Amino acid sequence: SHMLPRNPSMADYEARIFTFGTWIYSVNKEQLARAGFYALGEGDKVKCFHCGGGLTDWKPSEDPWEQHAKWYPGCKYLLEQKGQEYINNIHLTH
Template sequence: MGDMTPAEEIELRAACCHLFESSMRNEARRLRTFRQWPGTSPVSARDLVKAGFFFVGPRDEVQCFCCGGVLKDWRPGDCPIAEHLKFFPSCNFICGEDVGNQEMLPLQEIFDTVDGQFLSLLQGIGSEETALPNEPEYPEMVTEEMRLSTFQNWPQYTDMHPEQLARAGFFYTGQDDVVRCFYCDGGVRNWSFGDDPWREHAKWYPGCEFLLRSRGREFVSSVQESFS
C-alpha cells in the first residue's frame, strides 16, 4: 500500500473514530453555523467551536461533531469545554484523542503557506489590518500541500502544472480541469497553454482576500485593466 496524502489521512482518522458528524470536524465550518447565534448568550461562538460544538438551534442549542451530544440553556460562567466533559465524559474529542479535528489557523499562518516572494506584503501589517471579513470557504484546503494532494487524477491533456494552481490558491475538484479557490470558492476551468493561475484568479475573482493579500491590489487592478 502506498503512502497516503494528507487529505486521505484526515479522512481515515475521521472514519476510524466513527464521528457523529464528520463534515463538522473543521472548526471554521462549525463557526459558520453560528450566524444566527443569539447575541444575548453568555458564551461565545468561538468557545463553543473550540469545545467541538456546532449550532443546531433552536435558541442556544449546540451539538458535538464527535459524540453527537447536545447542550443548551447556557448560563453566565459556563465553560463549554467543562460542560462538554461533564455531560459527555466518554466523548473521544473532549478526552483529547486525535479524531481529525481541524483547527482554525491564525491569518499569518494561512498566508505563510504562500510562496516566500509574497510574504513581504504581509510584513508590518498590524493585527487589526489583517482581520478578514470571512473564514476560508474550504479551510481544510488552507495549506498548499493539502491543495496539491487533490491533483492525483489531474487530466494529462492540460498543460497546467498542479504546483502552479495550488500555489495560486486552487485545489482540484475531480471534474475535467475544474479547480476552485480554497478561500473565495471561485471556480476556473478550460485551461489553455500559457494561462497564468494568478492572472486568471485576478481576472474572474478580483475581490478574493487571499488573492489580494498574496499579490496586492496593484497586481489585481492591472489584470482587471488589461481585460477591460
C-alpha cells in the same frame, strides 16, 4: 470577497497540491495550488479554497494567478499574496 476562507480543509497548500497528484492537464499543478486552487476530480475543474471561485476549460500557456484575478478580483487570498497592484494591473484595460 470575505476574509474568512470558504473551505478551511483546503487552506493548507499541501492539501491543495495533493488533489493534483495525477493531474494530466497543461496548466502547471504547482502554480495552480500556489494560486489557491484545488482539483475537483472532474476534468480540469478547479476551485479556490478561499473565495470559493471555480474555473474550468484551461487554455494552453494560461497563468493561474492571472485567471484567478481576472474572474475573482475580490478574492482575499489573492489580495494577501499578490496585493492590490497586481489585481489593478489585470483589470487595467476595463
